[PDB]
Symmetry: D2
Subunit: 305 residues, 4 copies
């Protein structure tokens, strides 16, 4: 009746994901983790917030992969984040495990992968779970551009959502920031540079800040989880309510940008049947070079698993 959202991974990102799912009355939630009491503690705390939010979403915790049965959405945040390339064979097992279960219990689910490096991890779980091309994507562009959009909006004093920006190729240090594609209220950013309301140095500074936003926060003695979770929930909500939002995520490339069996970030339309369109940007030569470097680094790491 009501959709079943399984969070495979109940860390700080899953915590905020469960909170936002209840806030929006989006579906019943299973908080899975391999740690033994944490998800049931979080699920109990979170269940109570149904009262304050006027919702009726069940939130239960679990340590059994069997609770994936009948999942409509699976969100995978589980995986190692230290004790750097060294983690890839480890996270490669976790994807083999999860994919095995996905294949048996919820072969028909919509999968969002978050585990980093996401463009590698989403492909491994693609192959081991056997779900179709248009039912599995990785978080990346929505998060990266949310930072880029926000930093520009603060310089120009406009509402953050009114800045549009495109970040493609791959999530991470090789992300492709497409300066040509930035608009403010639908207006090309270059018009604001011409108007001296923002300088090219400031734009390149903001690009560097964007690329390093995860590390900026970690140095402040915290970690990014609120913005990633809201980004994940935006993609999941576009699926569950058939909104067909144009969102940049990591999807299977079958020729686009000149690359053919790797995952990369590109604008997509997320609708009720899943990925409904893959939109190939008409990049010029400089950008295709930076895109090719982004894909190349995805294949560097993929050859090491």
């Amino acid at each position: 009746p009501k959709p079943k959202i399984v969070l495979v991974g109940s860390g700080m990102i899953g915590g905020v994901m469960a909170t936002l799912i209840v806030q929006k009355n989006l579906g019943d939630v299973v908080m899975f983790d391999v740690v033994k009491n944490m998800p049931q503690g979080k699920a109990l705390d979170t269940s109570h917030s149904n009262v304050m939010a006027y919702s009726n979403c069940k939130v239960t915790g679990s340590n059994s992969y069997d609770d994936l049965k009948g999942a409509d959405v699976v969100i995978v945040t589980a995986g190692f984040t230290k004790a750097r390339d060294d983690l890839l064979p480890l996270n490669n097992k976790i994807m083999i495990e999860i994919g095995g279960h996905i294949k048996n219990l919820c072969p028909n689910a919509f999968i969002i992968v978050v585990t980093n490096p996401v463009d590698v991890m989403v492909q491994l779980l693609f192959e081991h779970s056997g779900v179709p091309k248009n039912k599995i994507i990785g978080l990346g562009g929505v998060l990266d551009t949310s930072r880029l959009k926000y930093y520009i909006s603060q310089k120009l004093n406009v509402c953050p959502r009114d800045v549009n920006a495109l970040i493609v190729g791959a999530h991470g240090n090789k992300m492709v920031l497409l300066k040509r594609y930035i608009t403010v209220g639908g207006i090309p950013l270059q018009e604001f540079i011409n108007n001296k309301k923002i300088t090219d140095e400031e734009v390149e500074g903001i690009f560097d800040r964007t690329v390093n936003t995860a590390l900026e926060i970690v140095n402040l003695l915290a970690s990014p989880y609120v913005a990633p979770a809201a980004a994940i929930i935006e993609m999941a909500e576009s699926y569950l309510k058939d909104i067909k939002k144009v969102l940049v995520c990591s999807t299977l490339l079958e020729g686009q940008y000149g690359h053919s069996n790797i995952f990369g970030g590109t604008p997509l339309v997320i609708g009720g049947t899943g990925v409904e369109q893959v939109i190939e940007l008409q990049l010029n030569a400089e950008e295709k070079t930076k895109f090719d470097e982004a894909v190349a680094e995805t294949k560097r790491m993929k050859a090491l698993i």
Copy 2:
């Protein structure tokens, strides 16, 4: 304590405005009209929906301009729409004189959104008679017109309507300037979708003509536009009341931009807590600038007849 929103005019647009204000819990509403029972009936009906909406907005009706007192937002839909069409301008001019007098006396610090058509003339008349500052009065135009264009495009490309961005400037009405160069989908230039054969240039020009004529398409179907107009006003009004600083295309006073002065015209603005916080001049090429000159010129033709 809670903001006071006065709808000067309680027709179908004002009705949906009050309904949406209750849904969004935006503030107390006075539904004004010169007709004797219509606003009081609508307000009673609408007040009850606070229960379903989990809100606490008071909604009362009035036939007295004295209820403008202490208004924080004033929305003016009052005016004649028929009894060849320029003939209405002296009539609606006199209505703006009256409303402006009361605004000046009762809520001189209000934020004014004018809707009465032709809006680019009407918003200036009420600007002049009410004496409110330049940055506290605007006219509906771009949000409504572009909402149609965005929607018609979004359905052709099977994407979410809000993901289409478009600017329509100059004036609300037949001379609206449709800036094909500025249309994006998911932040992507529309021309890439034409290049990809996802939509043709002929289809885009059909959509432009459909947009320019959308009010008449609906009137011919034996209905009239009010839902989309009301939603557009509440978006503009919500950006002011909650200080969102949205970039919205509206009719504002031009003091040089595009080469025009002492006239109102549609251009992107930032609506924040202090009113209009920026007036954004698009860098139009020569042909777009020519069509903009025609829209303003048509606003000045009509303004000379009041």
Copy 3:
């Protein structure tokens, strides 16, 4: 993929329903009516508001019952209101027409009837459409109590939703106002009478005002449309999102209150499967007497079809 809501009747109530559906992104909308072009105009207007609402709901007009095909929710407001007892055989024939199509095109939909007298009509459409008891209900209690709730909240200066009240029996002049069941923020109304924050005379004034609110508004304007539409959408949203709200609605009585083979207003739970509970209030003898008068008047009108 996305739910299909067919508004059978595109008058002033259907107008606000389509608006609120787009506002809440609840589903695609068909505005049906027998007046010919008017619904296509209203839907066109309404469709554009998707942009302001950040939703994606298709909104089309229709003059063909064939668009009931695959409807997930059908909301019936259509029917004669002039040109009294004499309208009942006419509106019966309309329910026969609608029921015939519901039976052939969307037999598995959730039906909400509004056409008055609702407790008669929802029974007639129940029998001609053949839908289960629990997939069809009539508007009444949610709308009537909203008036009672609002007026109490304004005297006590509290948030209208924080007043709770039950109005049962039938929609219309014989509605049963259960003074014993009124709470404010969960507190019995009697405690506010004792505190002299409201008097029994004022409560009884509010009772008459509630009973006469439809006719009060008709005299200033027309029949009410904003609040009925928000009430129908509250009931319809409870179905579509499996919220399991306790709402007072007109349902088939199979013994409760001592009545059978008739529809009457009583608290029920609306969830993903439709009516999930019918809650029989433990009324005292005097309330049970006033309930009998409401159903009795429902059957007198039903004998005149």
Copy 4:
């Protein structure tokens, strides 16, 4: 223009508060704490979610009480919770003295919500050291406790959680008074469901114990709860900021009600635009009044140890 909400304490509860404030576009957020850099990191993370939430709240971190300046809402979660628990009361008292000192100089006009436990003591201490009016400072308690009771009842009866109404008064903590007589489901007295055998009194008392112990149940599986407390505080704060006049059970100054004076205790109140607009004295029976008196007595015990 836009409200300024200062979170004095940026732990796990404040984290969800900043998240929920951006989700609801309620105002700009200052995440204060004495632990250093950590709040600026959390604020940076949280700021970005403005994009997904369609809102415009500034979210910054701070380690300086000078950022209380111009606060419209102050929410106090800071305080010692470890390193018997009577031993923490003079410590957490001196923190209230510090916060109160700054409140008096920088934001004497704010609406204060105190959470530091034991809340009914701390909210009184902060009341006296800041000098804010009685109706501009309250403590978290009832909204949170009843959320558990409501949720569990609704899960046995299979109804929407919000449709259960219940009052829990006296004090936040182990002496909380669970008023079974006041429990309704969709406005129907709970007893009707017991009579109908849809839930037994025996199951109800299990739910009562579970509610009293929910904090400890979660602490053993995890830590102190943070999602529901933050949603509860934000419900109270939104009711203030949007003038909803919701009836919420919170800790307020008692000036005679229930037979008690110069003490704070949990009771239903109305939170509106001016703060506390009503204090509702439940007409408790003798045994309920006995349990209420015990809650205040335990608050007075701990207050005598500062």
